[PDB]
């Protein structure tokens, strides 16, 4: 009820931004082949 609502958009785009900037973090290079 507009105080809870603020709390959800924090928590969503906290973890969504960890997802988005996780695969931008040179993620294909993280393999057991090399580096």
């Amino acid at each position: 009820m507009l105080t809870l609502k603020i709390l959800v958009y924090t928590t969503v785009i906290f973890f969504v931004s960890l997802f988005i900037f996780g695969f931008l973090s040179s993620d294909p290079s993280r393999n057991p082949n090399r580096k």
Partner: protein, 334 residues
């Protein structure tokens, strides 16, 4: 050296107890909220207007239920397809009345299962595995999104969605029979063949390995202790189980290749459940199964009954009785 690189090194570490990964960044917060709301809504949750007629259906344990009858009730017919979060409900009492937690559980479930699926990909990348276990898990993800997401979309309401329970499942299956005739639809036919075939080739492969085990134990200890973990010797005579099934049916019907054998175990169920979950999907938009009612006639023109006409009279019994107060007009358009 940086704080982000020391965080990416931890979150993608296979040296954790459970691999978290980048999909776990939105698997774990989603599925723990679908869980922690499910346990509360299954145990302690007030009754829910499902038919939109202000007749609240009890579904939790504190309101006199058990494991079988208790269920998280779907949302109201009054809401229908509208998004109904907590902050758009003006109190939690108004939220729990109108079928609140069904949308909170389901939407955090389908995000967490579609992230559990991508997490099975990710660890296969970091371990050197060939990647496609997550394609086999697409088959229950197709079926979970068919009864919780796609079928409420094409029917236009989450109230037609599947109730999160055990007796609510059979309320879902029978009402789906009367309104859509799923048993005559060839995609439920192609997945009954998927799980009857799947449980066949499971118990047929699991018997021929256990039949042809090599002597490594005594008769006092267990059969299973003849396998030391991580050994490089083959633990069963595969030529023996090939010569058995090569005589049990005939010679040319037997896979001598164990790789092509262990692929056919993954093909048959998964293709059977992809096809089935697109049976619920095409019947979400009212493209029903076959209808052979009044199909056999004599030369006079009188209707001769068939087995489909007996099956029709079972469908007419459920059709005239499902949601016995919600209807006002002669045709169940919804």
């Amino acid at each position: 050296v940086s704080l982000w690189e020391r965080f990416c090194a931890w979150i993608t570490s296979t040296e954790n107890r459970l691999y978290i990964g980048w999909f776990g960044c939105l698997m774990f917060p989603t599925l723990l909220t679908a869980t922690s709301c499910f346990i509360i809504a299954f145990i302690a949750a007030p009754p829910v207007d499902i038919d939109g007629i202000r007749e609240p259906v009890a579904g939790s344990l504190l309101y006199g239920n058990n494991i079988i009858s208790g269920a998280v009730v779907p949302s109201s017919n009054a809401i229908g397809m509208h998004f109904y979060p907590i902050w758009e409900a003006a109190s939690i009492d108004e939220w729990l009345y109108n079928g609140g937690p069904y949308q909170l559980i389901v939407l955090h479930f389908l995000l967490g299962v579609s992230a559990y699926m991508g997490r099975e990909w990710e660890l296969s990348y970091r371990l050197g595995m060939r990647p496609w276990i997550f394609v086999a898990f697409s088959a229950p993800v197709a079926a979970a999104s068919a009864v919780f997401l796609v079928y409420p979309i094409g029917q236009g309401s989450f109230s037609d969605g599947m109730p999160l329970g055990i007796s609510g499942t059979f309320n879902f299956m029978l009402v789906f029979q009367a309104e859509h005739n799923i048993l005559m639809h060839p995609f439920h036919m192609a997945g009954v063949a998927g799980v009857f075939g799947g449980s066949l080739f499971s118990a047929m492969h699991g018997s021929l390995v256990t039949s042809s085990l090599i002597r490594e134990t005594t008769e006092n200890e267990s059969t299973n202790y003849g396998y030391k973990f991580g050994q490089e010797e083959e633990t069963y005579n595969i030529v023996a189980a090939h010569g058995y099934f090569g005589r049990l049916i005939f010679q040319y019907a037997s896979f001598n290749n164990s790789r092509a054998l262990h692929f056919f175990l993954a093909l048959w169920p998964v293709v059977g459940i992809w096809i089935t979950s697109m049976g619920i999907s095409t019947m979400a938009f009212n493209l029903n199964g076959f209808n052979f009612n009044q199909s056999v006639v004599d030369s006079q023109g009188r209707v001769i009954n068939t087995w489909a006409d007996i099956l029709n009279r079972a469908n007419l019994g459920i059709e005239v009785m499902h949601e016995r107060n919600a209807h006002n007009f002669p045709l169940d358009l919804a």
